């Protein structure tokens, strides 16, 4: 779990956002002049440079099949690409600029797109049959929504504080609760993220407090519930507001990045204490933080600089010697003078 500086990337400036696939092999660096730089880990090389647009590419999302990205810009085009040769299959010149795109994890014909002002409405790939997700109040002008882990539901979030849950395509109103922010003043939501094992999730509020909930708990709560949080996270010393949160590779180590100071904070899901504060160049302002799913190394995007933060295996490599244990003083023991199992190898 990351503890070092370990190197960085001076390859292409003006980096803005990135994310990963299921496997953690490439790195889709979003750029300001409408580019997606793709860099490799195990070979440390840049395979394909898709010069997509000229406008700031804001959101990105990989799919499960390993073929279909989706993005948008101030070009305001819901684009799509393929990593074989840079094949822009579709091109949706749309109004109302975009913040976040999100697939269904296995029914990858359905993508979920957040506009600027009104409600997120589920787009598709081929047809323009967008499925209207009914938000009641509509006076908040910034409403964010997402799936669960398996794509089995749709979770939403307004700016007042009320949370609604719909079915993934037929929109069953099954859960309704307003968040318990302060006493008389509630707050808005800025992101909600999800793991790769389990249905725990975080609520990135805007009174500098992260709140954590589970899916089974709110499905037990349901309509008109008061779900208490699993965990309440903040930092009262430095008085820090938050920018972007995520999860670990197992949903245990919450990695939330700052919005003032270029620093990472890492918690535990179970206990809930801070474990390590990371640092870097003190004269930057951090925007996007990427977590790697199968091997805990973090990426940090600020000023076009993307950094690789490993832990170097300082303990040692122990590939050769499970044997050969050490004797400190010269211990001597020089008195001494001197077809059971058949497992399918072809399996």
């Amino acid at each position: 779990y990351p503890e070092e500086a370990d190197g960085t990337l001076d390859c292409i400036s003006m980096a803005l956002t990135c994310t990963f696939n299921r496997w953690g092999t490439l790195l889709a660096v979003g750029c300001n002049d409408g580019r997606i730089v793709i860099w490799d880990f195990l070979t440390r090389g840049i395979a394909k440079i898709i010069s997509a647009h000229i406008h700031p590419v804001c959101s990105l999302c990989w799919s499960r099949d390993g073929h279909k990205l989706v993005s948008a810009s101030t070009d305001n085009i819901v684009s799509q690409w393929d990593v074989l040769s840079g094949d822009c299959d579709q091109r949706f010149r749309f109004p109302s600029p975009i913040l976040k795109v999100q697939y269904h994890p296995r029914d990858q014909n359905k993508v979920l797109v957040c506009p600027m002002k009104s409600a997120p409405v589920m787009l598709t790939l081929s047809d323009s049959k967008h499925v209207v997700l009914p938000v009641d109040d509509d006076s908040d002008l910034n409403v964010v929504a997402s799936f669960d882990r398996r794509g089995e539901y749709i979770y939403t979030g307004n700016a007042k504080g009320k949370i609604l849950v719909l079915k993934t395509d037929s929109q069953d109103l099954v859960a309704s609760f307003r968040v318990t922010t302060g006493t008389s003043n509630t707050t808005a939501i800025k992101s909600i993220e999800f793991a790769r094992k389990g249905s725990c999730f975080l609520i990135n509020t805007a009174d500098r407090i992260i709140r954590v909930y589970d899916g089974r708990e709110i499905l037990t709560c349901g309509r008109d519930g008061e779900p208490e949080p699993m965990q309440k996270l903040q930092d009262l010393v430095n008085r820090t507001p938050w920018k972007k949160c995520c999860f670990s590779g197992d949903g245990e180590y919450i990695v939330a990045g700052s919005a003032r100071q270029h620093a990472l904070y890492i918690w535990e899901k179970s206990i809930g204490n801070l474990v390590k504060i990371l640092h870097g160049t003190r004269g930057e302002l951090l925007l996007d933080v990427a977590w790697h799913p199968v091997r805990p190394i973090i990426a940090s995007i600020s000023s076009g600089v993307v950094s690789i933060w490993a832990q170097n295996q300082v303990e040692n490599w122990s590939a050769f010697a499970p044997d050969f244990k050490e004797l400190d003083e010269n211990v001597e023991y020089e008195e001494r003078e001197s077809e059971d199992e058949e497992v399918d190898v072809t399996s």
Binding site: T281, R282, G283, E284
Partner: protein, 97 residues
């Protein structure tokens, strides 16, 4: 031709620089030095001019005091010249190293 013997045009300019009191360090190289070694602690800083003047006066006074005590060490060692082991001795004795 006309030349002085060495030491004369030391003792004059010693009396002259002990009379006159202004700067003795050209201020734009000093301001670029301050911005250089303040770059490494925080980026995009912004100095007022009086702060640069204060740093200049403090560093000038520190170097003058250091050269007086170095001169004392050099006259003590029955030499006249100054060698860098004298400066290292003075900062060893004063308690800053």
């Amino acid at each position: 031709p006309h030349r002085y013997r060495p030491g004369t045009v030391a003792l004059r300019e010693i009396r002259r620089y002990q009379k006159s009191t202004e700067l003795l360090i050209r201020k734009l190289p000093f301001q670029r030095l301050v911005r250089e070694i303040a770059q490494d602690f925080k980026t995009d800083l912004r100095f007022q001019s009086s702060a640069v003047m204060a740093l200049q006066e403090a560093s000038e006074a520190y170097l003058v005091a250091l050269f007086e005590d170095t001169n004392l060490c050099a006259i003590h060692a029955k030499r006249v010249t100054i060698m860098p082991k004298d400066i290292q001795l003075a900062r060893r004795i004063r308690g800053e190293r």
